[PDB]
């Protein structure tokens, strides 16, 4: 009854193995392993912010030679407004609940926050993996710069 999709020595693999939120602004570590000779080394990482993924998506959709191609959708902007607001209300209510109840609700809201964080990391990673598997878009020079250039694209 085994039913397995097998991957053997893939040429280009991109993941986001770690991410940082600081006052709800996210820095994604974008990590590439590749056997392709078009990259400057076989394994490397860069830091990216959401705005950089939007730059990349916009650059690809504005490339007229890609009119016949399907560009994968941009990841959505991280949004922690919900759990953050609940945290602010909770903190204000600390005096009104037992220490036990507070600590339980605190850990629950932290779990909420983490779930939002994981989902956005998913939105961002899937986008890059969809690009990597496209036989044309994976070769795109702007996609390469996005993966390889270890400086802050925004500033």
Binding residue (CB under 5 A) for Cl ion from 16, 34, 55, 78: 78
**2 marked as part of a ligand binding site:** no
Residues 121-150 that bind Cl ion (CB under 5 A): none
**Closer by beta carbon to Cl ion, 25 or else 104:** 25
DSSP H or E segment with residue 48: strand 43-48
**87 marked as part of a ligand binding site:** no
Cα 22 from Cα 27, distance rounded (Å): 8
| 54-64 as b/e: b if 16+ CB within 10 A | ebbbebbeeee
83 interacts with Cl ion by CB under 5 A: no
**Closer by beta carbon to Cl ion, 5 or else 22:** 22
Binding residue (CB under 5 A) for Cl ion from 11, 20, 25, 51: 25
DSSP H or E segment with residue 27: strand 25-34
Q: Are 56 and 146 in contact (CB under 8 A)?
A: yes
Smallest gap from Cβ 48 to Cl ion, in A, equals 11
DSSP H or E segment with residue 22: strand 12-22
**Closer by beta carbon to Cl ion, 52 or else 140:** 52
Residues that bind Cl ion (CB under 5 A): 25-26, 50, 78
């Amino acid at each position: 009854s085994v039913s397995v999709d097998l991957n053997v020595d893939p040429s280009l693999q991109i993941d986001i193995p770690d991410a940082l939120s600081e006052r709800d602004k996210v820095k994604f570590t974008v990590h590439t392993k590749t056997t392709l000779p078009t990259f400057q080394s076989p394994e490397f990482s860069v830091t990216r912010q959401h705005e950089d993924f939007v730059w990349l998506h916009d650059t690809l959709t504005e490339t007229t030679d890609y009119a016949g191609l399907i560009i994968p959708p941009a990841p959505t902007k991280p949004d922690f407004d919900g759990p953050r607001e609940k945290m602010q209300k909770l903190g204000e209510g600390e005096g009104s609940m037992t220490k036990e109840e507070f600590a339980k609700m605190k850990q629950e809201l932290e779990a909420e926050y983490l779930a939002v964080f994981k989902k956005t990391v998913s939105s961002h990673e899937v986008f890059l993996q969809r690009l990597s598997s496209h036989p044309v878009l994976s070769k795109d020079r702007n996609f390469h710069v996005f993966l390889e250039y270890d400086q802050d694209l925004s500033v």
